């Protein structure tokens, strides 16, 4: 999903950024509530996420061709008695069916090796499944029997607790809780906040410009307008805080954008009609390892016995030279052992 | 305190009533309880939704999971009191019968229309069945259904819910399973287009504000909010149920001392929309009874 | 990708009033605000959705691998 930013930078239209969207006008919460949103962290409404909030998808593309050489590698099934259970994750031509689910280990391709008399298979090797999308197969310049093929894979990336999100104001925060829309504080107007960002992420950050976007966005929508926000249109005299703070008053809402709120749990009006609005937010790519990796026991090494690195092969975690000391310090000869 | 001293005093007024929503106030109750009602009408009142959705085939632009996710949101006009739940212990063949679930499919093939006004942009005349709406959703009755839902067929609350788009050669077809459930899980179940309350503001003026200060104070709030008196010239409150809590008055200094914005913690202004499934008054009934029940279930449970 | 089904903050259905919204800004030449009004979008959240749609789907539809 994608939208044209309510708060625009006029030059947006001229450069034609509508033909290639990138954000999504989001309802924003300037408040500390759940208390899981401190340390520059943030909060997402569950009911939004499922409703479709900034849902994305990933696409990987893999090429097959055992042209590591007089050809012998043909795609399909050979007469030899191969397993069988390959006839489900795969069609009779040796290429999989379109829109098939497949996780690590699953068959992708079937071919006969005339010098091996055994029909074998390239499998899928990503620590995460996918569905097929494309079906790419090309011949050489004429007959040159098939050799080269590929395909694309759809990989669901529902906004999970952990990926990064930040508006255009250097407001990087990670998600700590996906709060239930019922425990969320609702507005006098009757609005469960989409996003919650904590006010304690502001004083040592100084990104007031968001604060603007707020009333800026709220209004314009309420009235039906794109608010122009190109740099330096205001000066010390005519300030946004006023200009827009009016449009809000002339629309019917509180001046400085203050809105009355209630605590989803207790149910009584809070203390201050906390101030909130709308911001063009952006979903940051899975730029996270996230991938934990535990290690009961598995792969080691021939010359040392100690397990080697991995993550995808259950590699043990390194106890480097630094932690060696730490323990030494306390005086825990055993933990060391 | 006595439950009786409560029933005698407690009261409720109905402001506006409708098919899709209504307004009303509960007075003398405590805010804890009201709030409870809230979390309920949203997260615990059952309804119908599409869960499992099996793809017979899909060759449009809209990728699969997306497609699914969607319709699983579409509002469902079926009295959720006509279906039974689902036991999540039995395997898939015993878990889904007739009086258990609800079956719906949708089969659309799209092609080019060689009869287009040779010079048209619109995809309806250039292409055959390019757009797919919610009225396209087909109900396939199962046995105990051909009689059960014989009177009230199944139809999406909003028919023109634009579903899928496609150009010729493309098609979609895939029945989907559909049961009941509640919002506290997946909002698809939330039977309301939201619903919530608001404490009724109390505006109390300290000293009389007559003369010109009447038209200047009156115009510091929504309309009719502050009517001007006759002869006395002094303003007053008309209906505090019209205040937007703009706090406006508190801007112009002269008045920043003449009043005070406050609350009446026992007066609740309720408003409740609806997806379409259950009419409002109903969604309320269940909620109240929902709490009543949750309790009794406890009166009859022994301790460990 | 195309018109989101329900609203993002309440659930109120919305994926329908797309084709009418366009007809409102087109035939009736109403403004963005008043058009969102008579269309049943009161709270800003709902309005948001429509006011800023990107029917980018129609950009794809011009890449049909089933024709000349």
């Amino acid at each position: 999903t994608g939208q044209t930013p309510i708060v625009k930078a006029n030059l947006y239209d001229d450069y034609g950024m509508d033909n290639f969207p990138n954000g999504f006008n989001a309802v924003v919460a300037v408040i500390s509530y759940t208390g899981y949103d401190m340390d520059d962290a943030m909060i997402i409404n569950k009911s939004a996420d499922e409703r479709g909030f900034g849902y994305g998808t990933m696409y990987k593309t893999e090429k097959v061709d055992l042209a590591l050489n007089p050809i012998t590698q043909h795609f399909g099934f050979g007469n030899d008695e191969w397993p069988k259970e390959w006839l489900e994750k795969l069609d009779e031509d040796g290429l999989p069916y379109i829109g098939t689910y497949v996780e690590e280990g699953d068959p992708i391709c079937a071919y006969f090796d005339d010098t091996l008399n055994k029909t074998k298979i390239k499998t899928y090797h990503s620590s995460e499944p996918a569905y097929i999308e494309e079906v790419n197969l090309i011949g050489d310049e004429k007959f040159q029997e098939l050799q080269t093929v590929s395909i694309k894979y759809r990989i669901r990336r529902t906004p999970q607790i952990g990926d990064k999100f930040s508006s255009r104001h250097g407001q990087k925060g990670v998600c700590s809780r996906k709060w239930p829309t019922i425990d969320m504080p609702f507005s006098e107007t009757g609005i469960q906040p989409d996003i919650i960002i904590n006010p304690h992420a502001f004083p040592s950050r100084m990104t007031i410009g968001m604060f603007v976007e707020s009333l800026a966005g709220k209004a314009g929508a309420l009235h039906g307008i794109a608010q122009d926000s190109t740099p330096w249109i205001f000066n010390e005299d005519d300030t946004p805080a006023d200009y827009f703070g009016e449009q809000l008053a002339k629309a019917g809402y509180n001046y400085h954008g203050n809105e009355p709120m209630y605590s989803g749990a207790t149910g009584e009006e809070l203390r201050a009609d906390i101030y909130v609005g709308v911001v063009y937010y952006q979903r940051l790519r899975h730029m996270v390892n996230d991938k934990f990796q535990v290690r009961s026991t598995g792969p080691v090494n021939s010359l040392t016995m100690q397990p080697v690195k991995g993550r995808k092969r259950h590699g043990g975690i390194r106890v480097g030279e630094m932690e060696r000391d730490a323990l030494i310090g306390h005086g825990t000869s055993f933990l060391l052992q | 305190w006595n439950v009786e001293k409560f029933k005698k005093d407690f009261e409720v007024n109905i402001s506006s009533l409708d098919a899709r929503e209504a307004n009303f106030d509960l007075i003398n109750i405590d805010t804890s309880i009201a709030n409870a009602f809230r979390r309920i009408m949203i997260s615990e009142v059952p309804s119908v939704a599409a869960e499992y959705v099996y793809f017979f085939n899909n060759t449009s632009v809209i990728q699969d999971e997306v497609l699914a996710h969607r319709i699983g949101l579409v509002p469902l006009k079926v009295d959720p009191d006509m279906l039974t739940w689902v036991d999540s212990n039995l395997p898939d063949d015993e878990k889904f019968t007739d009086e258990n679930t609800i079956v719906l499919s949708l089969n659309v093939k799209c092609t080019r229309n060689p009869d287009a006004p040779k010079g048209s942009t619109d995809p309806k005349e250039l292409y055959n069945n390019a757009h797919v709406y919610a009225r396209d959703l087909k109900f396939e009755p199962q046995g105990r259904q051909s009689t059960t839902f014989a009177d009230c067929p199944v139809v999406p609350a909003d028919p023109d819910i634009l579903l899928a788009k496609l150009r010729p050669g493309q098609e979609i077809s895939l029945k989907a399973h559909c049961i009941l459930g509640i919002g506290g899980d997946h909002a698809k179940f939330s039977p309301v287009s939201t619903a919530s309350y608001r404490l009724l503001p109390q505006i109390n003026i300290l000293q009389p504000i007559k003369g010109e200060s009447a038209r200047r104070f009156q115009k510091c709030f929504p309309p009719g909010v502050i009517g001007i008196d006759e002869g006395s010239d002094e303003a007053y409150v008309k209906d505090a149920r019209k205040d937007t809590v703009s706090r406006e008055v508190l801007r112009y200094e002269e008045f920043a001392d003449k009043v005070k914005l406050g609350r009446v913690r026992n007066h609740f202004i309720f408003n409740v929309e609806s997806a379409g499934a259950m009419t409002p008054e109903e969604i309320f009934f269940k909620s109240v009874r929902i709490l009543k029940n949750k309790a009794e279930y406890l009166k009859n449970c022994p301790i460990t | 990708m195309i018109v989101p089904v329900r609203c993002f903050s309440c659930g109120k259905v919305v994926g329908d009033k797309w084709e009418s919204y366009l007809n409102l800004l087109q035939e009736d030449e109403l403004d963005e605000g008043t058009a969102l009004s008579r269309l049943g979008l009161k709270r800003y959240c709902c309005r948001r959705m429509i006011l800023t749609h990107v029917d980018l789907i129609e950009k794809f539809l011009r890449y049909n691998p089933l024709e000349k």
């Binding site: 005299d237 449009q247 002339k250 019917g252 | 929504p222 009719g224 019209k242 | -």
Partner: peptide
């Protein structure tokens, strides 16, 4: 310097809960 010109026809697009628009 021209002031950032306010676009005109700003109407009330908000009222209390459970209320119409015709009140005005």
């Amino acid at each position: 310097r021209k002031d950032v010109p306010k676009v005109e026809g700003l109407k009330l697009e908000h009222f209390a809960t459970g209320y119409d628009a015709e009140d005005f």
